[PDB]
Amino acid sequence: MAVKKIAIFGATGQTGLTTLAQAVQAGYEVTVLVRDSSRLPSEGPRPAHVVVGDVLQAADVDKTVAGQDAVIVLLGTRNDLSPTTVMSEGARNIVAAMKAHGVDKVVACTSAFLLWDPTKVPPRLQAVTDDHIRMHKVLRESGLKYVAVMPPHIGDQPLTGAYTVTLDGRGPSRVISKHDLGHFMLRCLTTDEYDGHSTYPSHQY
Ligand SMILES: NC(=O)c1ccc[n+]([C@@H]2O[C@H](COP(=O)([O-])OP(=O)(O)OC[C@H]3O[C@@H](n4cnc5c(N)ncnc54)[C@H](OP(=O)(O)O)[C@@H]3O)[C@@H](O)[C@H]2O)c1
Numbered sequence: 001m002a003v004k005k006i007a008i009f010g011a012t013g014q015t016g017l018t019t020l021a022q023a024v025q026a027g028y029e030v031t032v033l034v035r036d037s038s039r040l041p042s043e044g045p046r047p048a049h050v051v052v053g054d055v056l057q058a059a060d061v062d063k064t065v066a067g068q069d070a071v072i073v074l075l076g077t078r079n080d081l082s083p084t085t086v087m088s089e090g091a092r093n094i095v096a097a098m099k100a101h102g103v104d105k106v107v108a109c110t111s112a113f114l115l116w117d118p119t120k121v122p123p124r125l126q127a128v129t130d131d132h133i134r135m136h137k138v139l140r141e142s143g144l145k146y147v148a149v150m151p152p153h154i155g156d157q158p159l160t161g162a163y164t165v166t167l168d169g170r171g172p173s174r175v176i177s178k179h180d181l182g183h184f185m186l187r188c189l190t191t192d193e194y195d196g197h198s199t200y201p202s203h204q205y
């Protein structure tokens with residue numbers, strides 16, 4: 001039985017928007033949780049279901065996860081670099097909702113800093129990185145099938161589907177296009193080969 005129904009968290013963000021468009025075009029029945037539906041586009045592929053609410057509200061997350069086959073997590077803080085627990089608290093709610101509803105597959109984006117030497121995190125990104133680490137811990141300890149996606153710099157290059165995925169943070173470059181990152185999140189829905197692993201997508205454009 002393959003995945004047909006998915007929830008995407010963070011669908012209005014840079015990577016989320018293209019992951020959403022790609023998922024719908026690929027045939028998935030997609031539900032999104034958004035705080036502000038005006039951030040979803042009118043042109044192009046459209047999600048099947050829109051829940052208005054907040055990943056910090058358990059009931060909103062529960063409504064989004066109910067009935068799904070898998071969950072994609074592309075939560076982030078946009079340009080806000082201050083200390084934060086939004087992603088990890090969101091992940092706690094997602095895990096609880098998954099367990100309440102029998103959903104067992106989550107693919108979630110943090111960053112390659114969780115693979116690279118931690119002394120290399122730029123000071124300005126440390127607070128967000130600390131919450132990525134809390135989120136990764138939550139997902140790893142959940143006992144669900146969890147693919148940790150840890151990308152380098154997210155760029156605007158075209159979709160290629162030709163990127164390289166390593167398990168250790170080394171690879172052909174330190175960039176992945178947002179489109180290729182979304183393509184990889186979707187690839188993780190049709191294989192178990194990355195479950196329980198950390199993954200590093202990168203490409204030379
Ligand atoms: N930028 C880089 O080069 C880079 C590199 C490696 C890793 N990353 C990490 O990759 C992940 C994806 O980044 P991105 O740039 O695609 O993301 P992004 O543009 O920051 O988008 C964040 C998404 O999270 C949603 N969100 C935030 N708080 C929420 C809340 N309380 N309830 C519901 N949704 C909420 C946002 O919703 P709204 O639209 O409502 O704001 C938006 O959809 C992030 O965790 C980022 O730190 C980024």
Ligand SMILES: C=CC1=C(C)/C(=C/c2[nH]c(/C=C3N=C(/C=C4\NC(=O)C(C)=C4C=C)C(C)=C\3CCC(=O)O)c(CCC(=O)O)c2C)NC1=O
Binds near residue numbers: 111112174
């Ligand atoms: C507004 C903040 C912000 C800016 C302007 C920024 C710039 C920035 N990010 C880069 C890559 C990168 N940027 C990130 C990660 C992130 N980038 C993010 O904005 C967030 C929120 C994360 C997640 C913690 C990563 C993992 C790389 C690896 C790119 C490389 O190795 O060269 C690079 C390439 C090398 C360099 O640092 O000189 C720059 C300049 N990074 C920032 O964080």
